[PDB]
Amino acid sequence: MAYHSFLVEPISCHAWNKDRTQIAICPNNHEVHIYEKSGNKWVQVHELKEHNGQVTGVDWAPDSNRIVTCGTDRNAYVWTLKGRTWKPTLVILRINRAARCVRWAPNEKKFAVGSGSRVISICYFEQENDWWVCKHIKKPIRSTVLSLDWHPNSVLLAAGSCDFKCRIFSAYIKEVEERPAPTPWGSKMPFGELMFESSSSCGWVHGVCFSANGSRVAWVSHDSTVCLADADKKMAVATLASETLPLLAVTFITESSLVAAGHDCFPVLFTYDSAAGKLSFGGRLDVPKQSSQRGLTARERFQNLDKKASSEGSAAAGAGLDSLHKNSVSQISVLSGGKAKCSQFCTTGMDGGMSIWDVRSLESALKDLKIV
């Protein structure tokens, strides 16, 4: 539908209040300002610096307005809007070097973590610490986390790892929780325990996503496998890999269809039923925000006496990609109507612009799944 870069930030991540208004960002280096949806304009709203480890992910609990901040320092905190600014409120961990990603136990109980230090620093709040504290899954794990997904019952967890082996786990903490419901994958559910695995060490698992209720789960590696486990097919599994350029992201948008995106910058559809290994695509989804009438012959002349990239090609219509797809696209999300009835969706890029998109033109089908 629509786009603009009000200023050209390398938007390395994005996050919000649940009304998708105040855009927080991972910036260049260690320098954040939050901007906001000024109608559809974008205008500065905050300056943040005191999580000094650049930025990585966050988990902005978006109702309660609690950005658990992460990155290359243990000055990692719930940033909360203190009315004045988003400002730190410390977490204690036993990770080292960094935190890449962080993840509320969905009922906001606590969060899960991905360390610069092989580990899940399972972190839990203490009023007594005035802050969080942690305990550690240094083993039976071997290496650390890039992506995270709690199963909806919120004490049950999935992750994508630099330990590769596509494993399902439990991480209950006695001093904040009680152990979860008999998980069909595996139901030994204390701290640090392993429910199930798919033998896939097949690339470092890079995206993890439950279906609309998590009855099945998808995965992808950055080595660009695309994969699943389904419990009701009796702990069944599936795997595939794409044709196209290597993955930035994937999400379910139902229990049977998913959106994927890679270094091709355009999104592509995926589709499925319940035929175990029958992973299937659905083709490219977007249409460009450009048309062929672009040009300015005077500057084309001036800078054909000078010669910087001065032999033309439609690669340049996407600053090298074509499709207006730039130096690169950098993220995707649904705006509204959700993983069932989406009304709008959006994407970020190295260009620093908001973009929002043509959804319901593709609404043109009914029902899913087949027990195969």
């Binding site: 070097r97 290496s143 990239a309 090609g313 090298g320 730039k326 130096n327």
Partner: protein, 168 residues
């Protein structure tokens, strides 16, 4: 035209489409200061395959890839001293100008004739696929320039009596 060069470099650019991978991570057990990752590769499953690719029988490429940084090296049919040492008056001349373009694995590496050091930084620095659509093919054009120096140098052979005797 040498038309299987089209299969050749279309398949290069199909590899450089399958595997335009290079993107960053810093640390998880050892320090954040991103390395010559292709040199310092400890272990396989995180990374791209090590590879080599003949054009014929003397000619081939090496490519080797950490998930974030890459080698290339490329091999040529030519083998006379009159092919080599003469163009190596240039490949001497070349290497300080590598310091003016920053991605050579700056030597005329044997078994091949050259090598390259490539990294994710570049993916964030300016542009997209016009880059590799330049690079991979520019790399042929700088070979076609050997034909340019060829008649040049052979005409320096045509300097010879064309001075000394032709003085009279």
């Amino acid at each position: 035209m040498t038309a299987t060069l089209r299969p050749y470099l279309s398949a290069v650019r199909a590899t450089l489409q399958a595997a335009l991978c290079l993107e960053n991570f810093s640390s998880q057990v050892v320090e954040r200061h991103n390395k010559p990752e292709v040199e310092v590769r400890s272990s396989k499953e995180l990374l791209l395959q090590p590879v080599t690719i003949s054009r014929n029988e003397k000619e081939k490429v090496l490519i080797e890839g950490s998930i974030n940084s890459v080698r290339v090296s490329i091999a040529v049919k030519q083998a006379d001293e009159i092919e080599k040492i003469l163009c190596h008056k240039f490949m001497r001349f070349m290497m300080m100008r590598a310091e003016n373009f920053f991605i050579l694995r700056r030597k005329p590496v044997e078994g091949y004739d050259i090598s390259f050091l490539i990294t994710n930084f570049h993916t964030e620095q300016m542009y997209k696929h016009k880059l590799v659509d330049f690079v991979i093919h520019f790399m042929e054009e700088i070979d076609k320039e050997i034909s340019e120096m060829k008649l040049s140098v052979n005409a320096r052979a045509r300097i010879v009596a064309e001075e000394f005797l032709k003085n009279f």
